[PDB]
């Protein structure tokens, strides 16, 4: 499904992303916006046999298993299909594990380029959450 900006922010707050390991809620809402326009079904094929899945475009090369990606590590120990659900539970759990590595949110290029070091709070501003 395609989340509304505030709707996703509230769901993300509920799923404990606000201040998770120091990342305020804005960072996540912003990353989602630039990664998939808040679309849980977003999909993207890469030059290699990997595909990015979900609202946070998580890669099947390192994070999830789709059963047809060469060199799959499945770090999140989850089927990639679980990252396309309207229920963001899986995408958030995996995102939390990704950001728990040394390079935090720098795992999401879109975040660095279009969110890192900006007034990220502006993304949840206006939302009654």
């Amino acid at each position, epitope marked *: 499904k395609v989340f509304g900006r505030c709707e996703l922010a509230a769901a993300m*707050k*509920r*799923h*404990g*992303l*606000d*201040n*998770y*390991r*120091g990342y305020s809620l804005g960072n996540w809402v912003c990353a989602a916006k630039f990664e998939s326009n808040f679309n849980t079904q977003a999909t993207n094929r890469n030059t290699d046999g990997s595909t990015d899945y979900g609202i946070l475009q998580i890669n099947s090369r*390192w994070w999830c298993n789709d059963g047809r990606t060469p060199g799959s*590590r*499945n*770090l999140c*120990n989850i089927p990639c299909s679980a990252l396309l659900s309207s229920d963001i*539970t899986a995408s958030v*759990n995996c995102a*939390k*594990k990704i950001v*728990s*590595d*040394g*390079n935090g949110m720098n795992a999401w290029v879109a975040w660095r380029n279009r969110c890192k070091g900006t007034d990220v709070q502006a993304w949840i501003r206006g939302c009654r959450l």
Partner: antibody
Amino acid sequence: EVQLQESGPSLVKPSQTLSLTCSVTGDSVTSDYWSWIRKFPGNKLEYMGYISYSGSTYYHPSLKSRISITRDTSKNQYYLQLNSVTTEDTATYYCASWGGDVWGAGTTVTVSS
Amino acid sequence: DIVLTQSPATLSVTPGDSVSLSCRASQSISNNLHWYQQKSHESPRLLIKYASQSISGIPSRFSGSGSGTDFTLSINSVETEDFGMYFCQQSNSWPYTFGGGTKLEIKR
């Protein structure tokens, strides 16, 4: 199924170094984050630290400096080194996946001269 | 460091009774609270992750609730194999920390 097993000296002398090995079977040590957790005699638990995919480590500050966590991809194991121990480092040590879904049986290390 | 306080320190029940174990955090941790069971002579076992998410393979009598700083682990109809220690652990901020634990013991 993934399985973990700790091993190493059960006795370390004060001021010396404590070393433990965690053998990973079932999956690659490069395909998950790995941690070390210790349970003191009183039964309290302390999350010592973990090593993630990039090789980056996070160490507990109330310990930090003395601890080092490393891994060996060819042997599919990861390790724990804790320098300058004192009797207070006596505890049951466990290796576990970052997710907490898998734990070793644990191994007791006693610090005594 | 985030401090987690569990209560009661100990609880004596009769198999068949239901129980609720509390864990409170010194700072809000949203839903980043996990529950472990640890029997004597055994390693910890993850029962609930992220405050309320069920773990496939864990008995349905175990459930968790709460958010922010107030959490609860419920066991509806405690069974004879459920006695032991129960700890909560937060993963919201480093260093990860554990509560002091609650001991579930048999009533007689």
